[PDB]
């Protein structure tokens, strides 16, 4: 049933329920004093394990299964590090000044200096966490934002010259509109006026620009690690990185 997907027929409460049920688990770190190679090894090992759970989660984002396998691959390839980072920022909301990569790996700002060039990325992630805390981001809004990242990050890098590729973009934009409806639904339910609903919607979506910025910086750093060949990267992580270059 790809003509009239079930994602279009979901109510706002059923969208929120679906996304909450789809949530990946919080994985642990398999973690002696820190070094540059060990800290990056922990982070890339964690990332590689989370990537497997992300694939399962994406298949449960409403509308994502209606896409072709090729389009699903492209969306995860573009979005995967944005998705990891917004997850990280969300988990770090209640830990000001700290990044909760895992329940047993809670890194403060100064611990990012044992890896060169990582402190800038750390500061950007912390500032986003502070922003989400300042806005009192809710779990229901978080899962909407994360799904928007998945569907949006690669929607404009598609091909627009096929009769069947243009209807794939419309479906993506129709699912995206539904998630916007859902965010607005949650804000109206929380008692915000119309003016506050639109302002808060704008505020949340502008943070996605910063998340895109951080993922671009993080991709260059990851590429800088692959090149130095000092930190082991899984075959899957190497492929996800290779898709950005």
């Amino acid at each position: 049933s790809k003509k009239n997907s079930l994602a279009l027929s979901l109510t706002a409460d059923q969208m929120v329920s679906a996304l909450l049920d789809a949530e990946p688990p919080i994985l642990y770190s398999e973690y002696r004093p820190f070094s540059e190679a060990s800290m990056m090894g922990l982070l890339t090992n964690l990332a590689d394990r989370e990537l497997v759970h992300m694939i399962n989660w994406a298949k449960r984002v409403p509308g994502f299964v209606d896409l072709t396998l090729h389009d699903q691959v492209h969306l995860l390839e573009c979005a995967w590090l944005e998705i990891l980072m917004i997850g990280l920022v969300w988990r770090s909301m209640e830990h000001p000044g700290k990044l909760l990569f895992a329940p047993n790996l809670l890194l403060d700002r100064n611990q990012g200096k044992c890896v060169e060039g990582m402190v800038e990325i750390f500061d950007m992630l912390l500032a986003t966490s502070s922003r989400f805390r300042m806005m009192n981001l809710q779990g229901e809004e978080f899962v909407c934002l994360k799904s928007i990242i998945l569907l949006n990050s690669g929607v404009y890098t598609f091909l627009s010259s096929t009769l069947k590729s243009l209807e794939e973009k419309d479906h993506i934009h129709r699912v995206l509109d539904k998630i916007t409806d859902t965010l607005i639904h949650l804000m109206a339910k929380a008692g915000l006026t119309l003016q506050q609903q639109h302002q808060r919607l704008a505020q949340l979506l502008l943070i996605l620009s910063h998340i895109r910025h951080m993922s671009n910086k993080g991709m260059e750093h990851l590429y800088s690690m692959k090149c130095k060949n000092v930190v082991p990267l899984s075959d899957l992580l190497l492929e996800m990185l290779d898709a950005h270059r």
Binding site: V52, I55, A58, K59, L69, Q72, V73, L76, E77, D235, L236, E239, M240
Partner: peptide, 9 residues
């Protein structure tokens, strides 16, 4: 290619 295999399974 790994991502293809993961999405199908």
């Amino acid at each position: 290619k790994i991502l293809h295999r993961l999405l199908q399974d």
